[PDB]
Amino acid sequence: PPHRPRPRPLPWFPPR
Amino acid sequence: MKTFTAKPETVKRDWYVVDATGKTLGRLATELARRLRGKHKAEYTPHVDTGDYIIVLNADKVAVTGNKRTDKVYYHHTGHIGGIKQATFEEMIARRPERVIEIAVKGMLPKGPLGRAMFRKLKVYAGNEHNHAAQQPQVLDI
Amino acid sequence: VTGSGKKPWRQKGTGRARSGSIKSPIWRSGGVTFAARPQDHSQKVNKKMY
Amino acid sequence: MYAVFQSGGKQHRVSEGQTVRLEKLDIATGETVEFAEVLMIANGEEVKIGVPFVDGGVIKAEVVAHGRGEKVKIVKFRRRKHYRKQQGHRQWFTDVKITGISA
Amino acid sequence: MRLNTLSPAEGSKKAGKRLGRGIGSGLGKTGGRGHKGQKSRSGGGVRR
Amino acid sequence: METIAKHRHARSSAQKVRLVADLIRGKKVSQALDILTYTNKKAAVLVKKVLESAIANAEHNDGADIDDLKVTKIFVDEGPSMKRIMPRAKGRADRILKRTSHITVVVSDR
Amino acid sequence: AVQQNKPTRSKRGMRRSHDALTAVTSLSVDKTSGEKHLRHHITADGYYRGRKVIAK
Amino acid sequence: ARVKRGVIARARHKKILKQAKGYYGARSRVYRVAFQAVIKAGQYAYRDRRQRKRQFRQLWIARINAAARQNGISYSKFINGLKKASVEIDRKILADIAVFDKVAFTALVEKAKAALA
């Protein structure tokens, strides 16, 4: 069976 | 007072000629490797080539014991996938007899630049003639 | 140290070391780990030793 | 002419006029020291081989200098095991000048 | 008897332990607390 | 003996200017000026003005003869970088460096 | 895709071993005006192969 | 009593970097890398003081063997002969003599052969 979830995105954070 | 070290620019290298006829390959090769390295000289220095130039005649008539003549296999890989090639001692002697001695000796010499330099001093001929009269090689019985 | 108790960035996801306070002693402008207070240095001397 | 002698648990091949660094001898500078245990003396073609010592074989030397050799650094380090140790070392020596070799 | 010729008695003044100042000290890294567990932690340790 | 001219804080990265500087290092100044005139690089303009200034300095300040002058030393050093912002996708900003260079030309009759 | 290790200044220089400019092999001289020019190009004063070919 | 670390820290870093002179790339330039290089250089030097004594004896023996065989005897028999003859010359000296004074070396070989005969 699958051992990983299908890839997803992260929420936006103030980048720098 | 430091231990003596041979110097590449002052080391004396002589020329020898050996007849391979009927000699056992491996037992000839060890003596060649010894002399190419200069292990027979008191000035032996591991980082200097103090050995001698050696001509080997009649490489095509070198001997092997047992069933090696038909059963000793030489392998090489071309570097292409599936490119394992092979040749028996017999096939090698027919196609390129000089390679048999050269291969045996190369495997008994140090690996690295110095060992490659040492091997350049071996001159192997299939027949009984060479073109090094100018170097005046002395006969060497091995 | 003057400044708010706001967490500089969220605990996970940003790829930065975790931070809790702009006032951490690890940070430039942060607190002193073991900040001095006014101290009394006087020692007792037994009358007879004096 | 050269001779072989033992000193400081080591052997030395010397000719007259050579300066030789030995393990520290307890002999003041300027003073002469005799090495009476000569293993071999070779004067050209004549070769006297001690068994182990050459009878009547002596080497006269003058103590030129005492001193300490170049500093060596000892480093001990065991990776991942929070262990490291350093030490310095300078070995004492005595320089001697060989004045005479007698058979 | 001058202000720069007075000395404490021998043994009267022992230097305190300074944890976490390198290998040579013998108290570097973990500072004598060993590895992990409650007692290695700041404020760690069980009550009387 | 030797005369200097410099352009400090020239608006070009040292990497780009050094390409041109390499062409003229060691040359007679007349040959150098020709080389620079037919090099299609912005840096060739910058370097040529410094070289021309060095020649004028040698003549006016040091009473030298243009005919004898060689480019004996030329080097480009990194000047200060001006920092600018470049907006990228998704609210991210990148730093842009506006690199500058210090160009030094030394001419001499030796 | 990105480097796993920072390339050295040595490798940087090796890559740039082919970045050098070539100086113009040789300039030509106009036979009339005497001006230098790129071969097969008109001079700055509008000469080519001796002949005045353009104004300005 | 605030203590600033600059002056002392600079001196310590400089001491390591001076010991890393001649090393390649970051190893002679960058303290983190140089410190590891200098420690490793120290570890090898310690090991190599031991190995040096092994390498030289190995060299002396090889040379003695060559010279002995020129005089018609193997190293192993030669050394055995010298011991039976009560000759106490060490390998460093034998190797030295083998190179510089071949006549004296032949004298030793004869001495050794006599002791076995």
Added chain:
RNA sequence: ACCCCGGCGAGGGGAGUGAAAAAGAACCUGAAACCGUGUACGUACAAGCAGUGGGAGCACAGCUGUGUGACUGCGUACCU
């Protein structure tokens, strides 16, 4: 100040001030990373933590010192 190159530029070179301008305003000191120019030596048949032990040759300063390091034995970073 003034002179000179430059676009009546930027920037620079002289001159001059000053104890000092590598104190010239991007200004006391002016480290390191990082980037160059010059010189010495090595390097285009050679395989790996890049050192270490041995070691020629070349350059250089007073047989030693200093730089370099062909060739060769050994040798898989550090922290956790």
Added chain:
RNA sequence: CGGAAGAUGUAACGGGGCUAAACCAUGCACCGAAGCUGCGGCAGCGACGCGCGUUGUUGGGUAGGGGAGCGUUCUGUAAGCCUGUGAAGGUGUGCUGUGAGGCAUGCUGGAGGUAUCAGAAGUGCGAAUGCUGACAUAAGUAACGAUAAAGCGGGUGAAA
């Protein structure tokens, strides 16, 4: 001896090679470690004589316990001492100690520094996806933001 087939490449002696350079037996030589011995040096503990001598023995270490030090800033000693006979700092070199270190001195710097013995600590950093600044790398690489589109003559200008 046969029984004995595997997937990147010989690949089931480390290799060369070997009919012994294999195996069994017996023997004597030699090589071989940081073991042991030799020579020199250091330190701990203990004897033994008077802090020194003589001698035995010990000295691999993580957690961890014990002992002894180096250096930094600050206070006293110090209205002392050093300092254009050039302070601190910076950068070299030489010497020096078992180590942390120390001393001297060339250059830079241009006004401070501080013995000794005590005293107090914001007292030592390579790591914490540490914090701030500076600077690399990828790289002169991707890109230069709608594929409605330019061409030429003249002008001005250092340059279009």
